[PDB]
């Protein structure tokens, strides 16, 4: 019976302690404050707000079985608060995964959070006096629940889908433009070690120094790229002077040098691959826990003579609010970048 | 029950004593005009207003027996005054915590904050115009109990843990620079060729500048002094002279282990300036928590017993914080502690 009591108090306690640390970490440290992390702070503070203006009163309503006792104005304020807060969290996800496009030329990160917070209100603000004191309310409204289920769920869902697909395509294009140089350098070194005349080593060193500039597309990565370019130019000069017998040893030293930075560059490669993975994980948790919710909230409201399942309604509400405590868990146990506890 | 009025009169007298003492100390020191004490003026004003416009008539009622013979419109005016002042006190405590956290995290942008503080204190006291003389409302009661206590309490708690974490990070960064300079100086004492000296001295300069983040100026004067001495050593070293690197490193080590005394004194001063925040916010919570908890409970649990003795006790407990906060400000921090 009172399964919502224990579960509710555990959820509210671990969401009070959950997103609060995400706010105490950024505003304290300086090496971790980024516009991405500022968006994360806005998102977590949005989840911290829902833990008090909705969760306790929602749980107390669920204790009586869902039967409301106070007037209509208080219930309308609490419901509009919940709509604004969920819309704000999902549009904070929107702004976060929009800022996660480093392929763009500090920045005006104010506008994203501001528009998120404004449309969160603008979509949830017009309560029109609880639908104009609709008659026989006794103890949600048409043509507005549909609006707050489309503009607050479906549209940001397609936004997340578009953003992750664009991220996939962009990272694949970046790694392809890098793999071009990856293969050209090996082919040219092989040619140098197997050439026949002074022009073949020259062409191989040309194509080697050619691929050196196509990789400039994005601190210690600078000091590494400046030492081997001089060696490549020395090898090019030696090959220009008809010194293949010396260009071979030059290429041996060049391989021994560049393979020293290979092992430092692949770490950054895996660095960003894991970042994209954790982004996908955050969006996937959002979907997992808020899809059955808004699916029910749109279908049962649009499908009258179809089963709605009261138990399913309460369960999808509990799941959607479990998401509110899932995103600060993902930046915690699923992601190891937030070392400051 | 004569002891009730005795305690009430003593509490009113001590509210007057504490807040008027804050006022007189501000008006007789001239060195208290700092952002730390900038908010205490609003606190003293709000507490004196609570002790003149509520507490006399509040105790009138409390000794009358809760009957209240006053017209319900004057009752609503007094209730609005009490809401406004109890809201202004808590919002100004939140603003104190805000100022502390911002001073930890980074001119005069607190006038807007105090103006909004008192404006919102008035905004929560307006629906009493359209509302026994208790909080005779259900929807409004929860609203005022939530927006005026349940929000600022957790907000200042979060800001206070943020102050703790930021101060710990500042401490850790400066201790890291300390040990980095220790290691680099122990290296230069034993350095061999000149390129290693150049690299290590670049490292030392980088650490010295990375640490650079009435007496806060005397700490930075040693910063630029050490920077200029590192520049001296770097010139004498890149000129191809190894012994002069150590010659300058001797005085650099002297300056380094000399500034640490003032650094640790500053760390102790910051810890002491945060402990007063701890005590103040903790006492405020202890005093003003059960009142609003029982209020929101009685507003959420109608057919649930709330004895009026609880009402009187928690109201006295709430007013105890308005009595105590100037005393707590005077006991801690050496501005008022060393004068008296
Ligand atoms: Cl008697 C009673 C008392 C309180 C409540 N609560 C109010 C807040 N909630 C509304 C809500 C949660 N998620 C949403 N998503 C989109 C649109 C609306 C919502 C639901 C729970 C419900 C019944
Ligand atoms: Cl029969 C009777 C007669 C007079 C009173 N008084 C009215 C003014 N007071 C209201 C009050 C105290 N703290 C608050 N915090 C937030 C909001 C309102 C308040 C309490 C004392 C009470 C009962």
């Amino acid at each position: 019976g009172a399964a919502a009591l224990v579960g509710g108090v555990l959820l509210i306690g671990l969401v009070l302690a959950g997103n609060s640390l995400v706010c105490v970490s950024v505003a304290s440290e300086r090496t971790l404050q980024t516009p991405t992390n500022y968006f994360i702070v806005s998102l977590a503070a949005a989840d911290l707000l829902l833990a008090v203006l909705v969760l306790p009163l929602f749980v107390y309503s669920e204790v009586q079985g869902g039967v409301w006792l106070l007037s209509p104005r208080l219930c309308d304020t609490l419901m509009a608060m919940d709509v604004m807060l969920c819309t704000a969290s999902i549009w904070n996800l929107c702004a976060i995964s929009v800022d996660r496009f480093v392929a763009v030329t500090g920045q005006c990160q104010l506008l994203l959070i501001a528009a998120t917070w404004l449309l969160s209100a603008a979509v949830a603000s017009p309560v029109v006096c609880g639908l104009n004191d609709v008659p026989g309310r006794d103890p949600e409204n048409r043509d507005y629940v549909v609006y707050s289920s489309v503009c607050s769920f479906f549209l940001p869902c397609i936004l997340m889908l578009l953003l992750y697909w664009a991220t996939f395509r962009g990272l694949r294009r970046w790694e392809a433009d890098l793999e071009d140089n990856w293969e050209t350098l090996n082919d040219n070194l092989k040619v140098i070690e197997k050439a026949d005349n002074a022009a073949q080593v020259k062409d191989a060193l040309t194509k080697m120094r050619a691929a050196a500039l196509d990789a400039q597309k994005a601190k210690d990565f600078r000091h590494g790229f400046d030492i081997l370019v001089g060696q490549i130019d020395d090898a090019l000069k030696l090959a220009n002077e008809g010194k293949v017998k010396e260009a071979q040893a030059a290429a041996e030293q060049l391989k021994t040098t560049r393979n020293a930075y290979i092992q430092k560059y692949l770490k950054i490669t895996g660095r960003e691959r894991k970042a994209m993975r954790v982004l996908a994980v955050v969006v996937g948790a959002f979907l997992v826990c808020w899809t059955p919710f808004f699916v029910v909230h749109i279908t049962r409201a649009l499908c009258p003579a179809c089963f709605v399942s009261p138990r399913l309604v309460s369960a999808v509400t509990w799941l959607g609010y479990v998401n509110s405590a899932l995103n600060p868990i993902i930046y915690t146990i699923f992601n190891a970048e937030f070392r400051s506890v």
Side-chain angles (χ1 to χ4, degrees), chain A residues 1-29 31-72 74-128 130 134-136 139 143-168 170-172 174-189 191-193 195 197-201 203-206 208 210-218 220 223-251 254-255 257 259-260 262-263 266-273 275-276 278-299 301-336 338 340-341:
Chain A
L5 158 63
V6 174
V9 299
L10 295 182
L11 165 67
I12 197 176
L14 293 196
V15 78
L16 181 272
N19 288 276
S20 45
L21 314 183
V22 195
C23 308
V24 85
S25 59
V26 162
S28 152
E29 203 176 18
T31 73
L32 190 142
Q33 154 56 30
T34 73
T36 324
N37 305 30
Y38 202 45
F39 283 18
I40 297 172
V41 155
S42 188
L43 186 144
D47 295 351
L48 187 93
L49 204 159
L50 184 141
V52 56
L53 295 205
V54 170
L55 286 197
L57 314 100
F58 154 76
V59 167
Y60 207 0
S61 64
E62 292 289 302
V63 166
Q64 333 282 20
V67 186
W68 185 260
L69 296 176
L70 293 101
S71 64
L74 207 62
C75 169
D76 290 328
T77 58
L78 297 182
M79 281 201 306
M81 206 66 49
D82 198 333
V83 186
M84 181 172 56
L85 287 165
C86 63
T87 305
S89 44
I90 312 186
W91 269 85
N92 273 282
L93 290 165
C94 289
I96 282 187
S97 35
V98 155
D99 179 75
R100 282 295 90 188
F101 275 78
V102 81
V104 185
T105 191
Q107 289 88 352
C108 48
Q109 87 281 55
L110 164 72
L111 269 305
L112 252 52
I113 294 183
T116 280
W117 195 96
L118 282 167
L119 182 129
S120 315
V123 165
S125 296
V127 188
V128 289
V134 297
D143 289 345
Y144 181 90
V145 158
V146 190
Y147 192 86
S148 84
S149 283
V150 169
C151 285
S152 181
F153 181 73
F154 284 65
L155 211 63
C157 280
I158 85 166
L159 272 201
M160 305 296 94
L161 300 161
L162 291 168
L163 297 176
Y164 193 55
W165 199 83
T167 296
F168 221 66
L171 67 89
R172 282 182 94 98
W174 186 94
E175 271 264 17
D177 261 6
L178 203 72
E179 173 257 354
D180 275 3
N181 324 327
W182 272 83
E183 206 161 353
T184 56
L185 58 92
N186 278 102
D187 219 7
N188 300 138
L189 281 175
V191 168
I192 283 165
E193 299 269 345
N197 54 75
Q200 305 288 58
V201 182
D203 288 331
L205 281 160
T206 299
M208 258 173 61
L213 276 71
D214 202 6
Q216 213 168 339
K217 313 186 298 292
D220 280 328
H223 192 86
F225 187 71
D226 306 356
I227 297 188
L228 84 175
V229 163
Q231 297 179 349
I232 290 188
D233 289 328
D234 295 356
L236 191 272
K237 169 199 162 54
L238 287 185
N240 249 6
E241 259 159 20
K243 302 172 184 289
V244 185
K245 200 61 216 170
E246 300 75 348
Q248 295 177 1
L254 260 178
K255 172 189 300 185
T257 289
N259 306 6
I262 283 191
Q263 82 106 19
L266 191 132
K267 256 68 175 177
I268 310 174
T269 291
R271 184 177 181 170
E272 290 270 28
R273 186 157 55 102
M276 302 315 164
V278 84
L279 277 163
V281 167
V282 176
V283 173
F286 153 64
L287 286 188
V288 158
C289 294
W290 277 97
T291 302
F293 194 115
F294 271 91
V295 158
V296 169
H297 222 274
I298 192 174
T299 315
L302 283 179
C303 215
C306 300
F307 59 90
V308 177
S309 300
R311 165 177 63 179
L312 272 59
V313 162
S314 97
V316 302
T317 57
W318 195 341
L319 196 67
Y321 295 158
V322 158
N323 167 254
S324 300
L326 268 199
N327 67 88
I329 284 292
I330 297 188
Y331 329 133
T332 309
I333 173 178
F334 288 97
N335 178 26
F338 290 69
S340 55
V341 187

